[PDB]
């Protein structure tokens, strides 16, 4: 378990971004914050919901609302772009951490992804095994969620992601792939690829002819 | 005042054990849990243990069965042992310090880099390759399944065709094998007329294979 917050979460420069750790055992116990950038030691970036540790900017502000936790960033800089991750302390597993907010500052004009799904093909049902491709491309941050649909409801295994890669142009791309039996394929009306950026969310969707 | 800095492996292969050590500046090992952590995608950030100079150790449940960490406080070091890792305990990870007494309130402090461990199969393997079919542009591509190491390159029709090409970075999966797929973006005026042909070649395998992209019905 890891409570709830945002996956994205961006901003212009000098804008304020806001992060939401909640969950309800976020009421019990005070929630900490993380900073996470790679090749870099992650520090302590809040500490006691509202509490600001040493050599800390005093832009970052913290504060915290019935079963929701928040950080704030006031004036954010290029700096701040990194993983935050919310903790909170627990009983039996001693910690509990966030699913992680990858705050992105701005950076470019933003950009919609290019989306292209493919079906599995006949030659590798011939050879049993199955799998779905959806392709994302040239998008502006570098942040989305792929969630999988078999007919219209959610695919839980078989579900592989990549993490979004910059590209020549500046832009991201990132792919997606549901490994299938056989039978499962065919078995469904239909299934959907569908990949939210920012606000938008766009869908693409394929059937067993 | 008070530094930690980790050594791990880097690549481990499936199944065999994972050993990560740190390693404490100056301070001797006192008022601190030494703990490990790691940090990805998918599955996020958790705790993995910590320990005391005395032998005191807590670990995470879904990972306590595993997981074994020790001290050297002679060395001035703390290890971790895994036991047994896939392809999901690919991860970044970290070791870090927290204060001896009250944990409520507590948070870790001190973190090192720390070191990326990724877990893949043990034995070189060849690709897999699947035509993309298509549907004033359409795209069409080429899969490349279940391989390692890396790299694998991808060129259509022996590099003829280099235009609208883009060739995705691979997804390290559970089995502990890379997979990508490359595609091309051609006129919808095209097709029934110039062929179109992925070249992929895996050299760690000496695997070379050439596919035949055209719509089906």
């Known amino acids: 378990y890891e409570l709830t917050q945002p996956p994205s979460v961006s901003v212009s420069p000098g804008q304020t971004a806001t992060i939401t750790c909640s969950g309800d055992k976020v009421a019990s116990k005070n929630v900490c914050w993380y900073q996470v950038k790679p090749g870099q030691s992650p520090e302590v970036v809040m500490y006691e919901n509202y509490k600001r540790p040493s050599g800390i900017p005093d832009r970052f502000s913290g504060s915290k609302s019935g079963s929701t936790a928040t950080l704030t960033i006031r004036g954010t800089q290029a700096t701040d772009e990194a993983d935050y991750y919310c903790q909170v302390w627990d009983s039996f597993s001693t910690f509990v951490f966030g699913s992680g907010t990858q705050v992105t500052v701005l950076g470019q004009p933003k950009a919609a992804p290019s989306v292209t799904l493919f079906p599995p093909s006949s030659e590798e049902l011939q050879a049993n095994k199955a799998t779905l491709v959806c392709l994302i491309s040239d998008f502006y941050p570098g942040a989305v969620t792929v969630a999988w649909k078999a007919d219209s409801s959610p695919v839980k295994a078989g579900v592989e992601t990549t993490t979004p890669s910059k590209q020549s142009n500046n832009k991201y791309a990132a792919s997606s792939y549901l490994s299938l039996t056989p039978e499962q394929w065919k078995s469904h009306r239909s299934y959907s690829c569908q990949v939210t950026h920012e606000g938008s969310t766009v869908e693409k969707t394929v059937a067993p002819t | 005042q008070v530094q930690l800095q980790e050594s791990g492996p880097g690549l481990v292969k499936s199944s065999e054990t994972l050993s990560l050590t740190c390693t404490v500046s100056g301070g001797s090992m006192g008022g601190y849990y030494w703990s490990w952590l790691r940090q990805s995608p998918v599955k996020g950030l958790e705790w993995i243990g910590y320990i005391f100079h005395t032998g005191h150790t807590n670990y995470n449940p879904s990972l306590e069965s595993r997981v074994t960490v020790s001290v050297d406080t002679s060395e001035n070091q703390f290890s971790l042992r895994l036991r047994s890792v896939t392809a999901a305990d690919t991860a970044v990870y970290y070791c870090?310090?927290?204060?001896?007494?009250?944990?409520?309130?507590?948070?870790?402090?001190?973190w090192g880099q720390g070191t990326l461990v990724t877990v893949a199969s043990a034995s070189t393997k060849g690709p897999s390759v699947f035509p993309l079919a298509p549907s004033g542009t359409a795209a069409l591509g080429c899969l490349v399944k279940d391989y390692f190491p890396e790299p694998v390159t991808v060129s259509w029709n022996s590099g003829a065709l280099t235009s609208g090409v883009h060739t995705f970075p691979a997804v390290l999966q559970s089995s502990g094998l890379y997979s990508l797929s490359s595609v091309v973006t051609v006129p919808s005026s095209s097709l029934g007329t110039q062929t179109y042909i992925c070249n992929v070649n895996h050299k760690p395998s000496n695997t070379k294979v050439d596919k035949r992209v055209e719509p089906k019905s």
């Open positions: 870090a310090s927290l204060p001896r007494g009250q944990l409520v309130n507590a948070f870790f402090d001190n």
